[PDB]
């Protein structure tokens, strides 16, 4: 249950690839680090579809192997959007095994522990400062077997510290499929 | 107390200097405007060390004269990292004052009043939009006489209005050594 970062492109790369909308880059992993021109965050590939926060993504297209892809799913209120995963992209398999012990992968590959404290909440074991989570929305929370449970949507912060998190239940990703 | 920004590199410069990790540029001033392929934040040298927030820097090396400077101190759980100051590097001194009257300096050189609200908490006299503080984590939280009391981490905001800050105190920086 480790995870490590890997850059595939530099700024010049985001820039030209956001302009031409075309990405000849091989998709590998599960969790992707993505970027727009004003912020960066993650995207988790589940059930053959790339999920991410509407707050980071908006209505934007995803650069693809054959040109830019249009979001095929969008739910502005539940802050989640998805693009059909480009052919030849790995995808996580859902959980539903009751485990309350969840681990979320941040943008630097830090597997930080969270206890499910609700339907879309999860108690944060080591209350990190909120700044710590910045740029990690869109990332997964897995159950002890490594299967997906949701997408880190935002931070439940108490004036400084983040002692719990909000995520899109994988169930609310399926009612939209 | 006033500060002013100065740009030292354009697009071509960050990209090449980030590839090689070779920055033969002479460092000046106490706070550095740093950027990665995605974000652009700030860094403050306090008593010999170029400090910054871990969410921005990850575990990347700083671009240095001798080449890539692997970082020295790292308290990820406090979202902190720092590198051994490069040649010249005008460091800042810790607090001494007790003064609860701080000032936050932004990436545009905005000396903005904050009131020491705790070990790491701090009130902003006049709230501004959270876009105002974008790209400033890593910046300094000074005292009346200009001493480094803390490295700015993130704004505390509700409804797009930022009214408080969350910083790491100069004292926990030293506790790291």
């Amino acid at each position: 249950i480790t995870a490590y970062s890997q850059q595939t492109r530099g700024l010049l790369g985001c820039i030209i690839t956001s302009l031409t909308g075309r990405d000849k880059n091989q998709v590998e992993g599960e969790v992707q680090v993505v970027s727009t021109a004003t912020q960066s965050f993650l995207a988790t590939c589940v059930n053959g579809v790339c999920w991410t926060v509407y707050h980071g993504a908006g209505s934007k297209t995803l650069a693809g192997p054959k040109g830019p892809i249009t979001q095929m799913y969008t739910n502005v209120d539940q802050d989640l959007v998805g693009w059909q995963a480009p052919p030849g992209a790995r995808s996580l398999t859902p959980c539903t095994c009751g485990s309350s012990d969840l681990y979320l992968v941040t943008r630097h590959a830090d597997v930080i522990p969270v206890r499910r404290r609700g339907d879309s909440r999860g108690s944060l074991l080591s209350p990190r400062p909120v700044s710590y989570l910045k740029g990690s929305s869109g990332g997964p929370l897995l159950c002890p077997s490594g299967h997906a449970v949701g997408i880190f949507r935002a931070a439940v912060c108490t004036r400084g510290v983040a002692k719990a998190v909000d995520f899109v239940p994988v169930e609310s990703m399926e009612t939209t499929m | 107390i006033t500060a002013y920004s100065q740009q030292t590199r354009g697009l071509l410069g960050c990209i090449i200097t980030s590839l090689t990790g070779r920055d033969k540029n002479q460092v000046e001033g106490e706070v550095q405007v740093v950027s990665t392929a995605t974000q652009s934040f700030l860094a403050t040298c306090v008593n010999g060390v170029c400090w910054t927030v871990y969410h921005g820097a990850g575990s990347k090396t700083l671009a240095g004269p001798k080449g890539p400077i692997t970082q020295m101190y790292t308290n990820v759980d406090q979202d902190l990292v720092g590198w051994q100051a490069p040649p010249g590097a005008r460091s800042l001194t810790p607090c001494t004052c007790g003064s609860s009257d701080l000032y936050l300096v932004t990436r545009h050189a905005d000396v903005i009043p904050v009131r020491r609200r705790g070990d790491s908490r701090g009130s902003l006299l006049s709230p501004r939009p959270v876009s105002y503080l974008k790209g400033s984590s890593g910046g300094p939280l000074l005292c009346p006489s200009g001493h480094a009391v803390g490295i700015f981490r993130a704004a505390v905001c509700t409804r797009g209005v930022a009214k408080a800050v969350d910083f790491v105190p100069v004292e926990s920086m030293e506790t790291t050594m």
């Binding site: 249950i1 480790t2 995870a3 490590y4 970062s5 890997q6 850059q7 595939t8 492109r9 530099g10 790369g13 985001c14 690839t17 956001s18 302009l19 909308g21 990405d23 880059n25 998709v27 590998e28 992993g29 599960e30 969790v31 992707q32 680090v33 993505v34 970027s35 727009t36 021109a37 960066s40 993650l42 995207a43 991410t52 993504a57 934007k60 297209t61 995803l62 650069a63 830019p68 992968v105 943008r107 590959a109 990332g139 897995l142 490594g146 | 392929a37 995605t38």
Partner: peptide, 12 residues
């Protein structure tokens, strides 16, 4: 402009 994958995060 599009959203671009600038990196990946390998699980185990």
């Amino acid at each position: 402009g599009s959203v671009v994958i600038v990196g990946r995060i390998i699980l185990s």
